[PDB]
């Protein structure tokens, strides 16, 4: 399997700098050309730069020349994107990609990582338990959950019981409040409001603030 795994995303202040990483595996690194491509929130795709892994020779789209630098580390099959003097319009999901020779279509892409360029500061979520209740639902099953309140920026990931609980879990997309912070919820469908010998812990990972919270959910 070809895998491109990017990391290094998060929040950066305007004028600030940020370095992304793309770890390549499953193919011969030096055989291909490595690319960056970006997507502004709700906009099209924009090719950013490419680098031949053999020479370190890079070519950049004209809006990023002198501002962005690509480098590779051949010995650990990894590609970098060093971004400098960032501004608000640089806020985007950044993908690494792969192409072959002179034709720059992209067969393999990384998962994408969000770079947010903003005046605001990072904020880990306040996580609250949503106690199990039969009367909470319209459809006659019981539910419990976690309210993930007041964090910045996106993304947050949620799992339950460190990934052991997947059935009946629904994690809702975040709302952006007027305060400028995000809130989301994750709900678990359960038999009743009595939990017996079941444990329910929601694991909330907020990579941008280096914060994880694992919240225990119990009856009122």
């Amino acid at each position: 399997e070809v895998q491109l795994v990017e990391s290094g995303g998060g929040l950066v202040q305007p004028g600030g700098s940020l370095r992304l990483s793309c770890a390549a595996s499953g193919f011969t690194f030096t055989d291909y050309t490595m690319d960056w491509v970006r997507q502004a929130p709700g906009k099209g795709l924009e090719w950013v730069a490419d680098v031949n892994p053999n020479s370190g020779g890079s070519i950049y789209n004209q809006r990023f020349k002198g501002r962005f630098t690509l480098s590779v580390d051949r010995s650990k099959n990894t590609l970098y994107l060093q971004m400098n003097s960032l501004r608000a319009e640089d806020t985007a999901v950044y993908y690494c990609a792969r192409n072959l020779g002179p034709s720059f279509y992209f067969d393999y892409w990384g998962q994408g990582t969000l770079v947010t360029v903003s005046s605001a500061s990072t904020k880990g979520p306040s996580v609250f338990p949503l106690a199990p209740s039969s009367k909470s639902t319209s459809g006659g099953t019981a539910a419990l959950g976690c309210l993930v309140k007041d964090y910045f920026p996106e993304p947050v990931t949620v799992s339950w019981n460190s990934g052991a609980l997947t059935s009946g879990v629904h994690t809702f997309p975040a709302v952006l409040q007027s305060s400028g912070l995000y809130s989301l919820s994750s709900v678990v469908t359960v038999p009743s409001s009595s939990l017996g010998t079941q444990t329910y812990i929601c694991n909330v990972n907020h990579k941008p603030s280096n914060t994880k919270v694992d919240k225990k959910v119990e009856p009122k």
Partner: peptide, 24 residues
């Protein structure tokens, strides 16, 4: 389907209150 939760006892003690209405 609509699921509505009241503020948690933890939230209230932090002198905040949020009602949560989940629609699926």
């Amino acid at each position: 389907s609509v699921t509505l939760f009241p503020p948690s006892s933890e939230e209230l003690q932090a002198n905040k209150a949020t009602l949560v209405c989940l629609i699926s």
